[PDB]
Amino acid sequence: MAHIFVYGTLKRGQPNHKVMLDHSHGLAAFRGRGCTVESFPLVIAGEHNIPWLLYLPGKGHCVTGEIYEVDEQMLRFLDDFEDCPSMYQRTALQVQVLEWEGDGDPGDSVQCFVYTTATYAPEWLFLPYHESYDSEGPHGLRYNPRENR
Protein backbone atom coordinates (compact mmCIF):
# COMPACT_ATOMS: atom_id res chain seq x y z
CA MET A 1 0.00 0.00 0.00
CA ALA A 2 2.89 2.37 -0.88
CA HIS A 3 4.39 4.58 -3.63
CA ILE A 4 7.86 3.93 -5.06
CA PHE A 5 9.98 5.38 -7.85
CA VAL A 6 11.60 3.31 -10.60
CA TYR A 7 14.80 4.52 -12.21
CA GLY A 8 14.87 2.18 -15.23
CA THR A 9 14.75 -1.49 -14.30
CA LEU A 10 10.99 -1.92 -14.66
CA LYS A 11 10.53 1.09 -17.07
CA ARG A 12 12.18 1.11 -20.52
CA GLY A 13 12.96 -2.51 -21.34
CA GLN A 14 15.07 -4.14 -18.65
CA PRO A 15 15.29 -7.85 -17.66
CA ASN A 16 13.77 -7.18 -14.22
CA HIS A 17 10.41 -5.90 -15.61
CA LYS A 18 8.92 -9.47 -15.66
CA VAL A 19 8.62 -9.49 -11.84
CA MET A 20 5.68 -7.04 -11.81
CA LEU A 21 3.89 -9.00 -14.60
CA ASP A 22 2.78 -11.75 -12.15
CA HIS A 23 0.65 -10.36 -9.27
CA SER A 24 1.94 -13.30 -7.17
CA HIS A 25 5.35 -11.48 -6.97
CA GLY A 26 3.30 -8.43 -5.84
CA LEU A 27 1.04 -5.61 -7.04
CA ALA A 28 2.12 -2.84 -9.40
CA ALA A 29 -0.05 -0.05 -10.89
CA PHE A 30 1.10 2.96 -12.99
CA ARG A 31 0.47 5.63 -10.34
CA GLY A 32 1.73 8.44 -12.53
CA ARG A 33 5.34 9.20 -13.50
CA GLY A 34 8.21 11.38 -12.25
CA CYS A 35 11.80 12.38 -11.79
CA THR A 36 14.13 12.89 -8.79
CA VAL A 37 14.22 16.73 -8.77
CA GLU A 38 16.55 15.94 -5.88
CA SER A 39 19.89 15.44 -7.70
CA PHE A 40 21.48 12.07 -6.77
CA PRO A 41 24.67 10.22 -7.83
CA LEU A 42 23.48 7.63 -10.36
CA VAL A 43 26.79 5.90 -11.16
CA ILE A 44 27.48 2.64 -13.13
CA ALA A 45 29.74 0.21 -11.21
CA GLY A 46 30.35 -3.49 -10.51
CA GLU A 47 31.67 -6.14 -12.92
CA HIS A 48 28.06 -7.04 -13.82
CA ASN A 49 27.13 -3.39 -14.74
CA ILE A 50 25.16 -2.83 -11.53
CA PRO A 51 24.59 0.97 -11.33
CA TRP A 52 23.90 2.33 -7.83
CA LEU A 53 22.06 5.30 -6.40
CA LEU A 54 24.14 6.51 -3.51
CA TYR A 55 22.05 8.41 -0.91
CA LEU A 56 23.39 11.95 -1.54
CA PRO A 57 20.66 14.63 -1.85
CA GLY A 58 21.69 17.48 -4.19
CA LYS A 59 24.82 15.72 -5.62
CA GLY A 60 24.55 14.58 -9.27
CA HIS A 61 21.53 14.62 -11.65
CA CYS A 62 17.76 14.17 -11.77
CA VAL A 63 16.87 10.56 -12.60
CA THR A 64 13.82 10.43 -14.87
CA GLY A 65 11.52 7.43 -14.21
CA GLU A 66 8.02 6.23 -13.21
CA ILE A 67 5.82 5.95 -10.06
CA TYR A 68 4.29 2.61 -9.27
CA GLU A 69 1.79 2.03 -6.51
CA VAL A 70 2.78 -1.27 -4.89
CA ASP A 71 1.45 -3.70 -2.35
CA GLU A 72 3.43 -5.05 0.53
CA GLN A 73 4.40 -8.15 -1.51
CA MET A 74 5.98 -6.16 -4.39
CA LEU A 75 7.79 -4.01 -1.80
CA ARG A 76 8.91 -7.29 -0.10
CA PHE A 77 9.92 -9.08 -3.33
CA LEU A 78 12.24 -6.16 -4.14
CA ASP A 79 13.42 -6.52 -0.48
CA ASP A 80 14.85 -9.96 -1.47
CA PHE A 81 15.55 -9.66 -5.21
CA GLU A 82 17.88 -6.66 -4.58
CA ASP A 83 20.01 -8.47 -1.90
CA CYS A 84 19.20 -5.64 0.53
CA PRO A 85 20.12 -4.95 3.29
CA SER A 86 23.54 -6.30 2.12
CA MET A 87 23.70 -4.69 -1.32
CA TYR A 88 21.13 -1.83 -1.15
CA GLN A 89 18.99 -0.33 1.65
CA ARG A 90 15.37 0.87 1.15
CA THR A 91 15.15 4.65 1.72
CA ALA A 92 12.80 7.65 1.23
CA LEU A 93 13.52 10.52 -1.25
CA GLN A 94 11.81 13.48 -3.08
CA VAL A 95 10.32 12.77 -6.57
CA GLN A 96 8.70 15.39 -8.84
CA VAL A 97 5.41 14.06 -10.03
CA LEU A 98 5.38 14.38 -13.86
CA GLU A 99 1.84 12.89 -13.80
CA TRP A 100 -0.44 11.77 -10.91
CA GLU A 101 -3.13 9.19 -11.62
CA GLY A 102 -6.09 9.16 -9.20
CA ASP A 103 -6.92 10.64 -5.80
CA GLY A 104 -4.34 11.37 -3.08
CA ASP A 105 -2.54 14.32 -4.79
CA PRO A 106 0.63 15.31 -2.84
CA GLY A 107 1.34 18.41 -5.04
CA ASP A 108 4.16 18.55 -7.65
CA SER A 109 6.46 16.39 -5.64
CA VAL A 110 5.93 13.18 -3.66
CA GLN A 111 8.00 11.14 -1.14
CA CYS A 112 8.58 7.72 -2.74
CA PHE A 113 10.65 4.75 -1.56
CA VAL A 114 13.79 3.77 -3.58
CA TYR A 115 16.70 1.35 -3.05
CA THR A 116 19.92 3.28 -2.30
CA THR A 117 23.32 2.68 -0.69
CA ALA A 118 25.03 4.68 2.10
CA THR A 119 27.83 2.11 2.54
CA TYR A 120 29.75 2.83 -0.69
CA ALA A 121 33.50 3.00 -1.42
CA PRO A 122 34.90 6.51 -2.31
CA GLU A 123 35.84 5.42 -5.87
CA TRP A 124 32.15 5.60 -6.76
CA LEU A 125 32.12 9.39 -6.10
CA PHE A 126 34.77 9.86 -8.84
CA LEU A 127 32.38 8.12 -11.33
CA PRO A 128 30.19 10.05 -13.86
CA TYR A 129 26.49 10.82 -13.31
CA HIS A 130 23.51 10.12 -15.61
CA GLU A 131 19.80 11.13 -15.92
CA SER A 132 18.32 7.71 -16.83
CA TYR A 133 19.50 4.04 -17.02
CA ASP A 134 18.50 2.29 -20.26
CA SER A 135 19.92 -0.87 -21.87
CA GLU A 136 19.04 0.76 -25.23
CA GLY A 137 21.66 3.50 -24.68
CA PRO A 138 24.83 3.84 -26.85
CA HIS A 139 27.14 3.33 -23.79
CA GLY A 140 27.70 -0.40 -24.41
CA LEU A 141 27.60 -1.01 -20.59
CA ARG A 142 24.34 -2.96 -19.97
CA TYR A 143 23.23 -5.27 -17.11
CA ASN A 144 24.38 -8.92 -17.21
CA PRO A 145 21.89 -11.05 -15.19
CA ARG A 146 21.62 -14.13 -17.51
CA GLU A 147 23.05 -12.53 -20.75
CA ASN A 148 22.02 -15.53 -22.90
CA ARG A 149 18.71 -15.02 -20.99
Curated annotation (Swiss-Prot):
Quaternary arrangement and interactors, per the entry?
Monomer.
What positions does UniProt annotate as the active site of this protein? 82
Q: What is its EC number?
A: 4.3.2.8
> Whose protein is this, by species?
Mus musculus
Protein name as annotated? Gamma-glutamylaminecyclotransferase
**Stretches of the chain forming a coiled coil according to its record:** none
Pfam entry (one):
GGACT
Q: Could you confirm whether the keyword Lyase appears in this record?
A: yes
- State the protein's purpose: Contributes to degradation of proteins cross-linked by transglutaminases by degrading the cross-link between a lysine and a glutamic acid residue. Catalyzes the formation of 5-oxo-L-proline from L-gamma-glutamyl-L-epsilon-lysine. Inactive with L-gamma-glutamyl-alpha-amino acid substrates such as L-gamma-glutamyl-L-alpha-cysteine and L-gamma-glutamyl-L-alpha-alanine.
Select a single GO molecular function from the record's annotations and give it.
gamma-glutamylaminecyclotransferase activity
Which GO terms fall under biological process for this protein?
A: modified amino acid catabolic process
Lineage in the entry?
Eukaryota, Metazoa, Chordata, Craniata, Vertebrata
- Annotated keywords: Lyase
